[PDB]
Curated annotation (Swiss-Prot):
Broadest EC class assigned to this enzyme: lyase
Location within or outside the cell: Cytoplasm; Cell membrane
Activity: how regulated: Activated by X-ray, histamine, L-adrenaline, L- and D-phenylalanine, L- and D-histidine, L-His-OMe and beta-Ala-His (carnosine).
Role according to the record: Catalyzes the reversible hydration of carbon dioxide. Can also hydrate cyanamide to urea. Stimulates the chloride-bicarbonate exchange activity of SLC26A6. Essential for bone resorption and osteoclast differentiation. Involved in the regulation of fluid secretion into the anterior chamber of the eye. Contributes to intracellular pH regulation in the duodenal upper villous epithelium during proton-coupled peptide absorption.
Record: active site: H62
Lineage: Eukaryota, Metazoa, Chordata, Craniata, Vertebrata
UniProt cofactor note: Zinc. Can also use cobalt(II) with lower efficiency, but not copper(II), nickel(II) and manganese(II).
Effect of H62A: Reduced CO(2) hydrase activity, rescued by 4-methylimidazole (4-MI). Reduced proton transfer. Enhanced proton transfer. Enhanced proton transfer capacity
Effect noted on mutating V119 to A/G/I/L/S: Reduced CO(2) hydrase and p-nitrophenyl acetate esterase activities
Main localization, broad class: cytoplasm
Natural source organism: Homo sapiens (Human)
Outcome, altering H62W: Impaired activity, rescued by 4-methylimidazole (4-MI). Impaired activity, not rescued by 4-methylimidazole (4-MI)
Cited PROSITE patterns: ALPHA_CA_1, ALPHA_CA_2
Name assigned to this protein: Carbonic anhydrase 2
Residues where Phosphoserine is found: S163, S170
């Protein structure tokens, strides 16, 4: 793969290697709040992260992933629009070079400074690789970040970034509690979509929280010091690693509230 977020290999180029980029249920999308319809049939979302076991943090050249042990039903997402149990495997963020951009989903065209994605796979499929080949294989919980007060629960992530500055670097990252990254309210919008990076597979039930979390300018500034490049290569700051909104096509966004 040679895809990325640069002028020559960015989102507008992805369709050449990944034709599904122009598919029928691509993500992210703009969430038009006035058109989204309240669905009273939606169940309350269930986020059970008390037994979450984080293991490592990795700079993969596109973002950084905080990985979890998903070999057992520990941290799971269920309820809401979901049927079954989805296991947390990793979380990562997308952010911008400026506070005025960075999120993938937008709300009434508003772009947030960043967006957190907690990725879960449907246990009925056995493993993540098999799950991404199914229309209901993944559930990604998206949370917007705005710049204001610091998020205490995010600081451990911010402080370890120095150790994984470049592509391919990883660091032990145990005992991190993802509950510290959640907003107060679990109200959400949901729609069927896709992974937002190649392979862009149409296997995701998106659940995007209405309430953003606040992070400090210093916290997001640290994200912007990461590198897309590997050690010993020309420095390319890891910023604007977000895909813009895609055509909604034949889909309806439902609201839980
Ligand atoms: N942002 S998002 O939609 O929330 C998201 C969620 C999960 C993932 C994820 O774990 N990888 C998907 C990509 N693959 C690498 C890959 C890339 C291109 C290919 F053709 C095949 C595999 C590693 C696993 C990526 C993005
Ligand atoms: Zn993502």
């Amino acid at each position: 793969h040679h895809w990325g977020y640069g002028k020559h290999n960015g989102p507008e180029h992805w369709h050449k290697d990944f034709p599904i980029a122009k598919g029928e249920r691509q993500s992210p999308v703009d969430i038009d709040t006035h058109t989204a319809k309240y669905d009273p049939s939606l169940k309350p979302l269930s986020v059970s992260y008390d037994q979450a076991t984080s293991l490592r943090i990795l700079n993969n050249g596109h973002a950084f992933n905080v990985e979890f042990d998903d070999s057992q039903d520990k941290a799971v997402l269920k309820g809401g629009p979901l049927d079954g149990t989805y296991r947390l495997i990793q979380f990562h963020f997308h952010w911008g070079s400026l506070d005025g951009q960075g999120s993938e989903h937008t709300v009434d065209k508003k772009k947030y400074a960043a967006e957190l994605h907690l990725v879960h796979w449907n246990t009925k499929y056995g493993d993540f690789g098999k799950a991404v080949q199914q229309p209901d294989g993944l559930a990604v919980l998206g949370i917007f970040l705005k710049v204001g007060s610091a998020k205490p629960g995010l600081q451990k992530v911010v402080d370890v970034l120095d150790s994984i500055k470049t592509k391919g670097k990883s660091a032990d990252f145990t005992n991190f509690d993802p509950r510290g990254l959640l907003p107060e309210s679990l109200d959400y919008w949901t729609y069927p979509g896709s992974l937002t990076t190649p392979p862009l597979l149409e296997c995701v039930t998106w659940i995007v929280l209405k309430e953003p979390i606040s992070v400090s300018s210093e916290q997001v500034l640290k994200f912007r010091k990461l590198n897309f490049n590997g050690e010993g290569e020309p420095e390319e700051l890891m910023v604007d690693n977000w895909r813009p909104a895609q055509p909604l096509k034949n889909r309806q966004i439902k609201a839980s509230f």
